């Protein structure tokens, strides 16, 4: 959730997010916009993917 | 959900959903799956197939494809580009699965030639004959009669001899026999535009109708080359009688079967509006003329050339006279007592022809007893729809639909007057009719930019639609039904192999009767449909 009060967490904007691309870090994104924010296991079906 | 109304198999598959069962059910596995791809995606080339089917290239495609060609379920056209090499390409043979889909009815073709020997070994004989001729492909009396026993009377064992001609039965099929009719029109489109004595660029009209006429008139003998050719029929060798050419492979003609079965539906329509005597008369009245008339045969080029809002009239009026004058000479003029049981003096009894009035026959050359067709047959077909929406929605529906027939684009305010019933019914028997389409809708904006309520609504017919999606009947149980035949098989699938080598248990005998009555339903049910199918798809 957002800002002070409610509880923590901060913003990575597309304006900022690009930054790490220039450095070239893949693993920092996958840690960042993947593991550390919403890590989630979806069960899909190879045949007729859904 | 619940699978009983079967949605998965139930909608997104029209048209093709028929075939992909037929070739599946009637051939199976790899043999099927090709045609599904073909019809779906249209034109296709040998190598290009396996780009999709995942069918183990140049194995099945070779095997399955030529296998189909022997049964002529595919259309086959090859040429080379101007760049080089050469290439083939394939289509699904016209209907052609038409043959399979009919089958035992094409067996019922016996009933016409059923005369001479009636319900004899001869019946069973010719039965075995034709039912084999469809099963294999083109046949030769030489190689089939060779497979048939020798050392018995060959023109007799195989007694269907001069009878090989009739209307139906066989024609030598070669080359131009099955090619896309369109593309053969495009090929004959050479020699005319491609051959011009380099005259002038001026007036494409001289380049066109001339070429078209040449295209047309050359096209005629192209279809008449298979029509009849004496070098088949005429052969009368020594110590023998007049025979076909036993050498060439000949194949079942579809259209004279088409023609003949159409005659039956006319016998049904007339079998209403006239008397059983006059009916039966008319029933043998076609039997002399049932040969010639095209029915589905003449429109022909109507598929495969752009019409012209001028020239298409030159096509239709051509159809207006086509059977009337010269084929009229082949048609009823003076005919006497074909079979018959009315008795004693038969002549004024023949004068009953004038009793036929509506909405068919009832014309002639001035006073010779004759029935026009080239006008009649076309001006007839447009009537045939009729019922097929009586038990469907209830009879109260017809009259208003039927009302929408005569007058047109007519508002329900004056429908309420013209037809007769309260609002409570008309609202349903109309709305119930509109979801099933037919009637469609017109509207006009009334003091509106484009609005619903303030506008006013009108109706119409536009019969092309109403006729058309009655071909849901195609996908309807000619598909779903036939599948309800298939999924049944797996129950006794373990039994099927047993009953094959049997000719045990009480409950096995019980489900025998079960699956058997089941079947006898499913196919007779089919024939019930197909009889209702023959109208729409063609004519």
């Amino acid at each position: 959730t957002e800002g002070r009060s409610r509880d923590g967490g901060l913003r990575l904007g597309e304006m900022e997010r690009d930054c790490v691309i220039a450095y070239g870090a893949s693993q920092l994104l996958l840690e960042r916009l993947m593991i550390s924010s919403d890590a989630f296991e979806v069960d899909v079906c190879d045949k007729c993917g859904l | 959900v619940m699978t009983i109304s079967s949605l998965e198999q139930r909608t997104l598959n029209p048209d093709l959903f028929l075939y992909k069962e037929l070739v599946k059910a009637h051939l199976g596995e790899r043999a099927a799956s090709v045609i599904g791809m073909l019809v779906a995606l249209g034109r296709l080339s040998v190598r290009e197939l396996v780009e999709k089917i995942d069918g183990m290239d140049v194995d099945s495609v070779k095997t399955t494809l030529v296998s189909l060609t022997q049964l002529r379920c595919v259309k086959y056209l090859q040429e080379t580009a101007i760049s080089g090499k050469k290439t083939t390409y394939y289509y699904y043979n016209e209907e052609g699965i038409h043959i399979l889909l009919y089958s035992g009815l094409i067996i019922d073709e016996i009933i016409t030639q059923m005369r001479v020997n009636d319900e004899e070994e001869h019946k069973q004989l010719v039965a075995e004959i034709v039912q084999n001729v469809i099963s294999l492909g083109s046949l030769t009396v030489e190689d089939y009669l060779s497979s048939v026993t020798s050392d018995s009377m060959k023109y007799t064992i195989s007694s269907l001899f001069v009878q090989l001609c009739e209307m139906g039965y066989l024609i030598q099929i070669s080359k131009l026999h099955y090619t896309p009719i369109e593309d053969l029109w495009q090929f004959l489109y050479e020699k005319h535009y491609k051959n011009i004595p380099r005259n002038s660029p001026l007036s494409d009209l001289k380049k066109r109708s001339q070429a078209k006429m040449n295209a047309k008139t050359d096209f005629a003998k192209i279809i008449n080359k298979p029509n009849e050719l004496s070098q088949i029929l005429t052969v009368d060798p020594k110590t023998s009688l007049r025979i076909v050419k036993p050498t060439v492979s000949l194949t079942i003609n579809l259209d004279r079967f088409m023609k003949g079965r159409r005659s039956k539906q006319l016998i049904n329509l007339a079998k209403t509006r006239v008397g059983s005597v006059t009916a039966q008369v008319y029933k043998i009245a076609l039997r002399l003329t049932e040969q010639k008339s095209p029915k589905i045969r003449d429109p022909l080029t109507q598929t495969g050339l752009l019409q012209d809002l001028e020239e298409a009239k030159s096509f239709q009026d051509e159809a207006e006279l086509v059977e009337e004058k010269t084929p009229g000479l082949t048609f009823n003029a003076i005919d006497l007592a074909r079979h018959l049981p009315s008795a004693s003096l038969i002549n004024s009894h023949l004068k009953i022809l004038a009793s036929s009035n509506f909405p068919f026959l009832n014309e002639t050359k001035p006073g010779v007893y004759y029935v026009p067709y080239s006008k009649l047959m076309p001006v007839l077909k447009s009537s045939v729809y009729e019922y097929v929406i009586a038990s469907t929605l209830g009879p109260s529906a017809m009259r208003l639909s039927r009302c929408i027939r005569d007058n047109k684009l007519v508002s329900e305010k004056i429908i309420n007057s013209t037809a007769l019933m309260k609002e409570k019914d008309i609202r349903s028997t109309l709305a119930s009719l509109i979801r099933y389409n037919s009637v469609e809708i017109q509207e006009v904006p009334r003091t509106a930019d484009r609005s619903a309520s303030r506008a006013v609504f009108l109706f119409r017919c536009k019969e092309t639609h109403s006729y058309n999606f009655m071909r849901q009947n195609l996908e309807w149980n000619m598909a779903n039904l036939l599948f309800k035949k298939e999924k049944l098989k797996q129950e006794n699938s373990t039994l099927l192999k047993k009953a094959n080598r049997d000719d045990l248990l009480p409950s096995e005998l019980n489900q025998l009767k079960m699956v058997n009555e089941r079947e006898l339903n499913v196919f007779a049910r089919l024939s019930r449909l197909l009889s209702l199918w023959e109208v729409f798809q063609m004519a």
Binding site: T1, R6, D7, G8 | -
Partner: protein, 522 residues
């Protein structure tokens, strides 16, 4: 609710320190859920009527500056009130009126039913009707007890004056308190004693205000005001202790409401006296009230107002009635003897003059009875105690009413000791109920008794047997004065000439409408 998947303890605590907000057990310290997911940021006859009732309801609400809050409680009563279809065929106003009033009573607030009414045309009676009516249907008893301490407040604000009134308030209430223990308080519109005590302390506070401007807030009568004032004038230490320093005497002395005091002016053991009995009779044959109206001493036929004939007799001081259908009501009966006896005498006119007029369907519908216990009564605790069967409605009538189930009879209650009984078809059930609730009377007292036998006098069927029950026995019980009770032919003619003479306007629209019946064809 859940259990630790390990410690199997049920005690869970959500730690708010570090801005996790995890849920954990105090037992093994395992977490239940981390990541505390939180949220953030048709066509009915009933919707129309209901939400329309929140409209009309909320309307009358802030007019009275009641809490908007209470509206929602009242509304849902209206909801439940619709469930019994009690709300259908009455005036919408009277319905929602009581629907709100019952609420603001349940909260013990200051709004008096009189004030609530004057928003309308209404008589503070039709509302008094509907309110007391839904008391039956929706089953409610104990809650609505109105008391003085509330009314003085809402009064006090509107009374102008100055901050002194607060003292006066503190003054007046203690006053009104003793008057309640002075045992004059019951049987009175609480507004009356409210404005009364207000005027009292105001005078005691030496400020001069009229009687009018008082009832301006009080909504009682001037005379009504000063009357109970005089009722205070004669009380114990009334003018004796009336001096200053806010008399601290809480000792009441006697309790003597001006109720049996009137009986003092007029002058189990005592059996309740019967009063009136009413029954029904069927002749079996329909008649003509026009023709029956011809010869009688006692008749009134006035179809313009009410369709019937009014009959009665001087002796044995009975009335009865007649219908058009050939039936009649039995009234004026102080006993069962005079009931069927005279009842047959009514058929002596008809069977003497009119049609067959048999005697059928004789059944007492109700019996009136009354008694007096000759001692004061406390109603406020009675309904506070027996309220399940005891409904003391607020100041919407002097007496307390009691609904007895066993057997089912209504009794009315006066602090004088006068106790009325009706709603009974049986004389025995009367005294059964009387000796039954007499221990409730004697039960509530502060500081005769011999029932003798539960049944003394002969039964009702004894007196019914004292009269000939055969519909064909008439001339035997005929007074022969009914031969005199018939007027002569001229009295009929000229009398009917006057009657018809003034009723031909009723007959005008009557037969004119009969012609309109022909007009109905077109």
């Amino acid at each position: 609710m859940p259990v630790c998947k390990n410690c199997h303890g049920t005690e869970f605590e959500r730690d708010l320190s570090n801005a996790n907000n995890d849920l954990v057990c105090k037992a093994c310290g395992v977490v239940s859920e981390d990541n505390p997911i939180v949220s953030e940021v048709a066509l009915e006859s009933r919707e129309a009527t209901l939400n329309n009732a929140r409209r009309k309801l909320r309307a009358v609400s802030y007019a009275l500056h009641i809490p908007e809050y209470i509206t929602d409680a009242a509304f849902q009563w209206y909801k439940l009130a619709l469930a019994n279809n009690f709300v259908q065929g009455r005036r919408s106003q009277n319905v929602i009126a009581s629907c709100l009033y019952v609420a603001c009573r349940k909260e013990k607030t200051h709004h008096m039913l009189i004030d609530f009414s004057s928003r309308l045309q209404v008589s503070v009676y039709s509302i008094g009707a509907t309110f007391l009516k839904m008391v039956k249907k929706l089953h409610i008893t104990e809650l609505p007890l109105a008391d003085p301490s509330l009314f003085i407040q809402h009064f006090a604000e509107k009374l102008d004056l100055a901050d002194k009134k607060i003292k006066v308030v503190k003054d007046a209430v203690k006053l009104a308190q003793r008057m309640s223990k002075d045992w004059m308080f019951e049987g009175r519109r609480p507004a009356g004693i409210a404005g009364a005590c207000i005027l009292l302390a105001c005078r005691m506070n030496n400020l001069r205000r009229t009687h009018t401007e008082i009832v301006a807030v009080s909504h009682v009568a001037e005379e009504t005001l000063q009357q109970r004032l005089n009722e205070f004038k004669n009380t114990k230490a009334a003018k004796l202790s009336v001096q200053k320093f806010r008399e601290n005497d809480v000792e009441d002395g006697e309790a003597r409401p001006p109720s049996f005091v009137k009986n003092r002016k007029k002058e189990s053991g005592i059996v309740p006296t019967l009063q009136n009995i009413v029954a029904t009779v069927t002749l079996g044959c329909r008649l003509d009230l026009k023709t029956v109206a011809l010869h009688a001493r006692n008749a009134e036929y006035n179809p313009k107002r009410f369709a019937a004939v009014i009959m009665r007799i001087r002796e044995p001081k009975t009335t009865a009635l007649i219908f058009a259908s050939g039936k009649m009501v039995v009234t004026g009966a102080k006993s069962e003897d005079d009931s069927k006896l005279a009842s047959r005498k009514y058929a002596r006119i008809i069977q003497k003059i009119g049609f067959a007029a048999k005697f059928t369907d004789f059944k007492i519908q109700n019996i009136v009875g009354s008694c007096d216990v000759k001692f004061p009564i406390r109603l406020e605790g009675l309904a506070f105690s027996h309220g399940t069967f005891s409904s003391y409605e607020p100041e919407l009538f002097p007496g307390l009413i009691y609904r007895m189930v066993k057997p089912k009879i209504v009794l009315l209650i006066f602090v004088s000791g006068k106790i009325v009984l009706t709603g009974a078809k049986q004389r025995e059930e009367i005294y059964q109920a009387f000796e039954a609730i007499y221990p409730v009377l004697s039960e509530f007292r502060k500081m005769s008794g011999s029932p003798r036998n539960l049944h003394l006098l002969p039964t009702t069927d004894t007196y019914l047997s004292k009269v000939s029950d055969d519909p064909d026995n008439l001339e035997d019980v005929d007074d022969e004065e009914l031969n005199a009770h018939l007027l002569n032919e001229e009295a009929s003619k000229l009398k009917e000439r006057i009657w018809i003479g003034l009723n031909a306007d009723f007959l005008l629209e009557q037969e004119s409408k009969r012609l309109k019946q022909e007009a109905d064809i077109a």
